Amino acid sequence: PIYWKATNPTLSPSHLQDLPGFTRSVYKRDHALITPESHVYSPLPDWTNTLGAYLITPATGSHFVMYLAKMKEMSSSGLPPQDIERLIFVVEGAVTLTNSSSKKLTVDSYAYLPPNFHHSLDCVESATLVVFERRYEYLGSHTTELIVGSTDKQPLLETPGEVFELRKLLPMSVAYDFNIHTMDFQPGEFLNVKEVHYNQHGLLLLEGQGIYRLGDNWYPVQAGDVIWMAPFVPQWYAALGKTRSRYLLYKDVNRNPL
Amino acid sequence: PIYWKATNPTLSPSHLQDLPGFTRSVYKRDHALITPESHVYSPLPDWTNTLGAYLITPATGSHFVMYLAKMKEMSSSGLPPQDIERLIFVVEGAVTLTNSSSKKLTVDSYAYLPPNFHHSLDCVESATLVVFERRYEYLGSHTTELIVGSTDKQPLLETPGEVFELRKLLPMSVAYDFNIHTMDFQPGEFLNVKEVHYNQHGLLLLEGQGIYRLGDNWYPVQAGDVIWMAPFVPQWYAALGKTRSRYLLYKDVNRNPL
Amino acid sequence: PIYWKATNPTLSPSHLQDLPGFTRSVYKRDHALITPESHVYSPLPDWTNTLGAYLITPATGSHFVMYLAKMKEMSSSGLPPQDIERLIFVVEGAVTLTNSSSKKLTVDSYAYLPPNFHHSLDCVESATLVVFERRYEYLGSHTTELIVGSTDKQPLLETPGEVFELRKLLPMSVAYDFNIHTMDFQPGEFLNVKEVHYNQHGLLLLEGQGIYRLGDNWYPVQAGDVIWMAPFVPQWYAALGKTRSRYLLYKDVNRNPL
Amino acid sequence: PIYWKATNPTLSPSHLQDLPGFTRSVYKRDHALITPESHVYSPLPDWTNTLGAYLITPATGSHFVMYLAKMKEMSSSGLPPQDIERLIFVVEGAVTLTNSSSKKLTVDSYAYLPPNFHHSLDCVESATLVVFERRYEYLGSHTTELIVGSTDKQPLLETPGEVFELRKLLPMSVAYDFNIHTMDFQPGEFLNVKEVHYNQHGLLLLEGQGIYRLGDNWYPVQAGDVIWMAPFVPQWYAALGKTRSRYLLYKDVNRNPL
Amino acid sequence: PIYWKATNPTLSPSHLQDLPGFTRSVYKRDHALITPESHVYSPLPDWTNTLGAYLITPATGSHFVMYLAKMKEMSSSGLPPQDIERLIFVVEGAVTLTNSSSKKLTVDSYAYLPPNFHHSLDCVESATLVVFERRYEYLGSHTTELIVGSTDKQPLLETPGEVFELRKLLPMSVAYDFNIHTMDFQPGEFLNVKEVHYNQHGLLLLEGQGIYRLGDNWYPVQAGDVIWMAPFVPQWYAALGKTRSRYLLYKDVNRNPL
Amino acid sequence: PIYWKATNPTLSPSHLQDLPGFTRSVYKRDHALITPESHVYSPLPDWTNTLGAYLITPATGSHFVMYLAKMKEMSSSGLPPQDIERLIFVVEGAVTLTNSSSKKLTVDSYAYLPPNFHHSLDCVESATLVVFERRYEYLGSHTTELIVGSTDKQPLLETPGEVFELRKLLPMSVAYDFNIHTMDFQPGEFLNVKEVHYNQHGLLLLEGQGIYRLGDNWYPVQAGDVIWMAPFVPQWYAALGKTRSRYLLYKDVNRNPL
Amino acid sequence: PIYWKATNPTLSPSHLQDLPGFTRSVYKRDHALITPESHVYSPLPDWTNTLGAYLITPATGSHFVMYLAKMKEMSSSGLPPQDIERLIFVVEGAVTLTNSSSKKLTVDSYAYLPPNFHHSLDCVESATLVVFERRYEYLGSHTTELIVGSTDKQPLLETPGEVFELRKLLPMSVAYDFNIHTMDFQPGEFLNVKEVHYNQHGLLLLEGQGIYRLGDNWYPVQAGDVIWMAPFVPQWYAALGKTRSRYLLYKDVNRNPL
Numbered sequence A, B, C, D, E, F, G: 001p002i003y004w005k006a007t008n009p010t011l012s013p014s015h016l017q018d019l020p021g022f023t024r025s026v027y028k029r030d031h032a033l034i035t036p037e038s039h040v041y042s043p044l045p046d047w048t049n050t051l052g053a054y055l056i057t058p059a060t061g062s063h064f065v066m067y068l069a070k071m072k073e074m075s076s077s078g079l080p081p082q083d084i085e086r087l088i089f090v091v092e093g094a095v096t097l098t099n100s101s102s103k104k105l106t107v108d109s110y111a112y113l114p115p116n117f118h119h120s121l122d123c124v125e126s127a128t129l130v131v132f133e134r135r136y137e138y139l140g141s142h143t144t145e146l147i148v149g150s151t152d153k154q155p156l157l158e159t160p161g162e163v164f165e166l167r168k169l170l171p172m173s174v175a176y177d178f179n180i181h182t183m184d185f186q187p188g189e190f191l192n193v194k195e196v197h198y199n200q201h202g203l204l205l206l207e208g209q210g211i212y213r214l215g216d217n218w219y220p221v222q223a224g225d226v227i228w229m230a231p232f233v234p235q236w237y238a239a240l241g242k243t244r245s246r247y248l249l250y251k252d253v254n255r256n257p258l
C-alpha cells in the first residue's frame, strides 16, 4: 500500500486523546517538526470543498509555502495568485488535471505548473495533495514549462559521497528555481555530510522512520511527519527499522544566493 | 459585573508592590504573555481624555496592533490612519458610536469599521475598550461594511472534534481579512488539536482561569491576561476552576499566506 | 505591629486562587525559595492543638530542620528527640516557657534549649513559632544551656567591610554549634561580599523586601519568604523599598568541617 | 565633575587585562548590555580628529543609532545624511555649536538638530558626546527645530505610579518623533510597573549603580554602562548604594505604532 | 606549502566516518562556526568545472556571501550579477585573472573587482578560492577600482591597544564599503578588547588553532574553520599551539550604519 | 583483528592535536560518555609494568569500578582488596591465568574471579583488558566459583520483545550479583523498550557505531567509547553503518533493591 | 615579588564595588570557580587569632578541605582534629614551623605534617597560607613523615604526552594518599589530554592567566583564582598572556578508587 503510512501514521492523533497538550511538534528559530496532531485543517479559499492545512509559509522566513490539501467529493482547485508557480504531489487518492490534453494523476504522480499557467485539478472522490507554491523568480527571458510524471518513472542519480538513492522530479535546467527530491535510505544508512548550506527545505516523510538531527536537536520521526529547514540549519538523517525510509524534499536552486 | 475579573484581576499589580521587579509577563520569539503589572498606559494621541496601552504591534512580527483604551469622563476616540480597519470591543462601561443614527455600546458590545469609514467614539462616565487595527489588505475588488453587535446575540457555530462554544463577531465572508472569535470552555475542557498554523493571534481572557501552552512553555493564566501568538507557534489551552473560561481572539483570514 | 507582614505577606496565597499551579517557590540543587502558598501544614506529632509546616530538613542535604508552628488555644510543645537541641523564635503572639522558673516569651522572644534539656512551651491563646532543631555535635566536655532573651536586648555588632546591622541571639562560645543572626539592611544597602562558604543557612524574612541572589538565580523576595542555602551556594542580598529589611538567619559554627 | 564615573567606570577595562576573553557585555534577541571593555573606537567618518563608537544601530532591529564621540583637540563634527535628525548630549569636556549666534556647550548641555539642519560642533580640547540619529518620521506639515539646553534647567516631570525623578530634554510636541529622558532613582527605589511596551530604548547610566532586569535576565550595572531595549522587552530597574542613580534614555513617540 | 592545513585540516571530515550525525558546526542566531565536515559543494552556476560551497549568505542577516570555490582543470569563472562587487583570495593552487592587465594569482594572492567590472579567472590544473561578493553601496559619485596584490607585500599596520599583526588587503579610501584584514597572533596572544560593533564579519582560519568566544559560547578552532559574525555579537580570540594563528577577515566599512 | 577498531577508534586522540580543549566526553548527573581523548593512564598499584585508566568508580554513585589495564611486556597483575570480585575481558593481546589448571587468555576471552579467590595474570607481550571490580554482596551462604571462557562459546539467549542478539558470560544463578551481557544489533536495529530500571551499567562499544540516548541527550558513538548509566537513567540504542554493532555491558542482578 | 598577584589580583574585589551582586564565582555539581570577591574570612576553629576562608570542604563531596589562612602579628596555628593530615604552602609573608629544630618557611615554602603529628605554625609579621587537610586513609602498616621543602628545590618530572613543567611537593610513596603538584605552562601551551579521572582537585592559580574548561563550561582565570574539580569532571587548560602560568594542585593517589 504505497505511502499508506503517510496518511495513517503508527502513532496517530487519536492515540493522545488522554494526554492534554501533548505534541511531538516543535517550531524553532531555524527549523520545525510539524506532526499530525498539530495539523490545522480549514477550507482553502478559491478551492471548492477542499480542506487544506498550511504547514509552512514565508512567516517562517521561507520563500515558499507547503500545505496539505484534502480534496473531498467533486472537489476543484483554485488558482495560485499571479506569478505563483505551483507543484502538487498525490500521496493518496486520485485527481485529474486539465489546461494541452487531460491527465489522471494517482498516488506518486505529480504536476508542476509555471507561473500564471492556466490549469485545473478536478477530483471526484478524494485525494491528499502535498503542494508547494512560490513567487517565481524570473531570470532573464527563461520560462519554466509544464511537467507531469511519477517518482518511479524518474531515473536514479549520482549520489557522490553518499549512498542513499536519489530521484528528481523536475528539470535541473536553470529556468526552474526549485526542484523536488525523493531520497531513499535503507535501515542503517545515513548522511555522510552534515549539511549546512544556504538552500532551504520542506520535507515530508513518505515511508519509514529514523532520527533527524536539526542544529543541536535530535528528533525521532515516522512516516507522515513534516520538516521545515531554514537556510543554514545543520541537518542529518538516519533510517531505522525493517522497512526503508523515503522522503519528499523541497530545495531551491539556480539563483544567486545574494 | 460582566467580565469584571478582566478589569479587576484576582491577582492585581498592587499585590506585588513588595515583590520588586516581579512579573508574570514574558516576551519570547513566537509568543507573549502580557499580564496586568506590565501594561503601560499613556495619553492616546488624537483621542480625548483617554489613556491607551499597546499590547501588541508589528514590531513583534505581527501585522496588527492590539491595545487597551481606558476612556475617562467626557472622552472621545480619535481616527485610525488612512486605509486602516478598526475593531473595538467593550470590556467595561458604556460608549456611544456615531457616524448614521448614533448607537449605544455597553459591556460585551462591539463594532467593526471598514478602513477610513468615518466614525466617532464618545463616552460620558468611564469605559474600557479592547481594540484591534490593521492596514486593510484589499482583495482586488472587495470591501467590508460597518458591523455592530453583542457576543451573546451571536450564534454558536459548529466546532468539529472540538468542544468549546464558538462565536464570531464578524462575517466569514471573503471581504474580511480577519475575524474575532469568542471561545468558551468548561472546567476540565481543553483543545483536542495542538495547533500549528500560519495564522496569528492576539487574545484576551475575559472570564475564567486555566493553563495555556506555547511552544515548550506552559503558562498559568487568569482573566485579564493577554497572549500574543505569532505564526506557527504551537498553542493549546485548558480551563480550570469552578467557572467557565472565555477569551477574545483575533485571527487573520481570507488572504493567501504567500 | 512587629513582624506583622511576616505572617500577613503582601502577596498572599489567596491572591493566587486564580492561577492554577502558579507559585514563587523553587527548590534547587544548592538552595530553595519556600514561599507562603507552598507551606504544608499538618499536626505536629507530640504537640497539642498545633499545626506545623516543615520548610527544610536533612532531606535537602542540611544538618538541621526548620519549621513553623502555629500554636492555638490551649496548645503545648512536645519534647524533641534525644540528643537534639531546639531554638524557638516567636514570630507572633505569646507563649510561656517552663522547665526552674517560667518565662513569658512574646514576639521577638527566643529560647535555646540544650539537647536533652527538659522544657515545655505552653500557649493559651495563639503563637507562631519559627523553630530550629539539630542533632547537637558534642565536642569536649563542653555543654550548652538554656538561653532566653529578646532581639532588642542584644547589642548591635559591627561587621567589617559590611554595612548591615547585626545581632547574634546565642552566645559565640565554642560549645554552641550554631547561632541565629538577625540582619538589617536599609533600603538600598547590600552585601559587599559575594559570599561562598561551607556554612549552611536557613532564613526567614521578617520585614522588608529586596532581591536575593543564589547561585546564578535572582529572586524577588518579600516578608514571610523562607530560604534554604546549602554550603557554598553563591549568595548575595539587596534591600529595596521604603521600609527596611530584616531577616532571621541560622548559621552553623565552631565545628571543624573535618 | 558631573558624570565622572560615566567616563571613568569603577570596573575599568584595564582591571580586566589578566582575564582573557572576559566581558560583562551581552547581546540577546530583545536587549543588550554594552560595557566599556567592549567599546570599539574607530575614526569617525566626516569628523575631524574624532574617535567614535557605535553602541546601537538598526542592525539590532532598532530605528536609531547611538554612539559615543571622543573629540580631541581641533576636532570638528560632521553633517549627517539627508533626512536624519541628530541629538548630542555632552558627557565630558566642551564643544561649540554654531550654525544663529554660536553656543558654548559644556557638560550636561545638549542640542537637537532637525533633519537637514546645517550645524557644526567644534571642540578645541576634548569632549565625550553621546549622540542619537534617526530617519525623521515626517508627519504632515509639522516640523521640529533647533533645541539647545541643559538638564538642570529642565523641569521635573511627574509620573503616575512611580517615584523616579524625570526630565525630558526635548519638546513633547507631536512634531517630535522621540524624546530623551533623564531619570533619577534614590537608593532603594525601583520601577513599580514591569514595563512592556512597543517603545524602544537606548540608555546611558550617567551616575550610580543598580540592578537591571531585561526579560528573564538580571544585570548588575554601573555608571558608564549602555543598554539596548528592543520593543516589548520586559524591563525593570532598581538603584542601589549610597549615591543616586541617573540614566539618559532614548524613547520614540508621537507616531502610530501600526 | 603556504596554508596547507587550511586545505587539509588536522581533524579531517573522514576521521569522523564512524560518528553518525556528529559535526562541530553551529549556526546560532547571531553567529556561526562552519567546519569542513559540513561544507556542501555543488556546481557553481556560470562557472566552468568549478565546485562551490556557500558558507554565508544574506539569509543569515548578512549583506554578503562567502563561499569556497574549487576550480579544477581548465576551469573558468562566471561574472557576478549587476552591481555585485567581488573579492577573491587564493588559498591553494594558481589561477589567472584578466581585464586592466593579466596576472598569475598563487597562494596568498587576491583581487578585488569593482561593481560591473568585467574580468575572468582561468585555472589550468586546480585552485581553491575563498570569495566574497556584495551588492555595492554607491556613495555619491565615488567608485572603487581593480586591486590585485599579495598578503605578504601588505605592510604591517598600527594596532593601538592590541598586539596582533594586522594587514589590510584593500585601500581605506571611502570608496570601499569593505576591506579584508589579515590578523596574526603569536601563541598565547589574544584580543585585549572584547569587541561589540555594528561591523559584521566573515573569517577563515588560514593557519594555527586556539579558542574563539562568540557571545557566551566557546569554540576550539583549527585551520580550515570558518566563522560568521553577525553585527554586535561579542567576539574574542586567543591563539594556542606551537605555530602562530592567522585568519582572513571580511569587514564592512566607510558607510553610515543608519 | 577482532575488536581492533575499539583499540584504534576511527576518530582518535591524534586527530585532535589542533583543537585545544576539544573533547567528546560528557560526565552528567545520571550518565557519562567517556571517549579515547579523555583517558588518563597511570601505573596501576600492585600491578607490574602496566598502565591503567579508570573510567567508572563509585565516586560517580556506582557500586563498582571499571577500567582499562594496558599490560606491557613481562607484565603481571595485582589482587583486589579483601572481598572484591573481579572480571577481566581481553579486548586485545594475550595473557595467562594461573594460581586449578592454567589457561592462557586471548582476545574475546574472559574470567570471573570470586572474592579473595587468589589468582594471577602475567603477560609476556602486550595486553589490554577491561576489568570490573566490586565488593561482593554475600546473599546468605551462596558463593561464586572461578569462570573462564569466550564470547562465541556462549549460548545466544533469547530476548522477549527484542531483536539484538544476546549472550551472557556468567551464571544467572542467584549466587552472582552481576552479569556481563554482550549485545549485537544489525544496522538499522534499535532497542524497542526505552529502558528505565534500578540496574546500573558500564559499557564498552566493541564494534560498530550508532546513536545512544541517555535521558534527553543523544550521542553519536563509535567503537572504543565508554558509557556509564546510573540507575533509572533512560537509555536507548540504535546501530548504523555497514557493519554490525556490539558492546560489553555490566549489570547488577539477583539482589534486593532496598 | 614571588606570587604577588596571588594576593593582589589584577581584578580586585574593590574594583567591583559599583556592581551589586556581581561575582566571578561559580559552584556547580562537579566543579567550582571560587574568586576573591567571594572569600569569606572568619576566625579559624582552634587556630589562635587567625582569619581563614574555606574554599572547599567535604560538604561539596570531596574528601579534603582547602582554605586560606591570614596570619598576622603574634598568631598561631591550632592542631587539626585527630587523624587529620595537614599541608601548608606559603603564598605570602613567612611563618615559623616548630614542634626537631624550628624552621623558617618563606614564600614558596611548604610543610606536610603526618596525622597526629604534634606541631604548630607561629607568625610574628604576616603570612598567607593555602592549606589542605584530610582524614588520612591509613593503609596497612604504612605511615608518613614530616616533609618540608621548597618548590624551586624540587625537580622537573617526566611529563609524557605533555609540555607543562611538573613538580611534586611530596614523595610518590604508596604511603601518601595525596600529593601536591606544581604545574607551569608557557603562554600558548595547553593540556593535550582532556582528562576525565576518578582523582579530585583543589587548585590555586599562583601565576599568570588563561582559559580553563570544566565540563561544558569555559572560564577566564587570573592569579588568585581557586578551582574545585570533583571526580570525573572533564578538565582542560591553556595559559595565555606575556607571563607564564603556574598553579598549586591537590591530587589524591595511592589508594584503591573503589
Ligand SMILES: NC(=O)N[C@H](N)C(=O)O
Residues within 6 Å of the ligand: A181, A195, A199, A201, A235, A236, A237, A251
Ligand atoms: N536535509 C537533506 O536531506 N538535504 C538534502 N540532502 C539536500 O539538500 O539535497
Ligand SMILES: NC(=O)N[C@H](N)C(=O)O
Residues within 6 Å of the ligand: B183, B195, B199, B201, B235, B236, B249, B251
Ligand atoms: N488559540 C486558539 O484558540 N486558536 C483557535 N483555535 C484558532 O486558531 O482557530
Ligand SMILES: NC(=O)N[C@H](N)C(=O)O
Residues within 6 Å of the ligand: C181, C183, C195, C199, C235, C236, C249, C251
Ligand atoms: N547570606 C547571608 O545572610 N550571609 C551572612 N552575612 C552570613 O553568612 O553571616
Ligand SMILES: NC(=O)N[C@H](N)C(=O)O
Residues within 6 Å of the ligand: D181, D195, D199, D235, D236, D237, D249, D251
Ligand atoms: N525601562 C525604563 O527605563 N522605562 C522608562 N521608565 C520609560 O519607558 O519611560
Ligand SMILES: NC(=O)N[C@H](N)C(=O)O
Residues within 6 Å of the ligand: E183, E195, E199, E201, E235, E236, E249, E251
Ligand atoms: N574578530 C576580529 O578579529 N575582529 C577584528 N579585530 C576587527 O573587527 O577589526
Ligand SMILES: NC(=O)N[C@H](N)C(=O)O
Residues within 6 Å of the ligand: F181, F183, F195, F199, F201, F235, F236, F237, F251
Ligand atoms: N542499555 C542497555 O542496552 N541495557 C540492556 N538492554 C539491559 O539492561 O539488559
Ligand SMILES: NC(=O)N[C@H](N)C(=O)O
Residues within 6 Å of the ligand: G195, G199, G201, G235, G236, G249, G251
Ligand atoms: N586538571 C589538571 O590540571 N589535571 C592534572 N594534569 C592532573 O590530574 O595531574
Ligand SMILES: [Mn+2]
Residues within 6 Å of the ligand: A195, A199, A201, A235
Ligand atoms: Mn539539505
Ligand SMILES: [Mn+2]
Residues within 6 Å of the ligand: B195, B197, B199, B201, B235
Ligand atoms: Mn489558533
Ligand SMILES: [Mn+2]
Residues within 6 Å of the ligand: C195, C199, C201, C235
Ligand atoms: Mn552567609
Ligand SMILES: [Mn+2]
Residues within 6 Å of the ligand: D195, D197, D199, D201, D235
Ligand atoms: Mn521603558
Ligand SMILES: [Mn+2]
Residues within 6 Å of the ligand: E195, E197, E199, E201, E235
Ligand atoms: Mn571585529
Ligand SMILES: [Mn+2]
Residues within 6 Å of the ligand: F195, F201, F235
Ligand atoms: Mn539497560
Ligand SMILES: [Mn+2]
Residues within 6 Å of the ligand: G195, G197, G199, G201, G235
Ligand atoms: Mn586532573
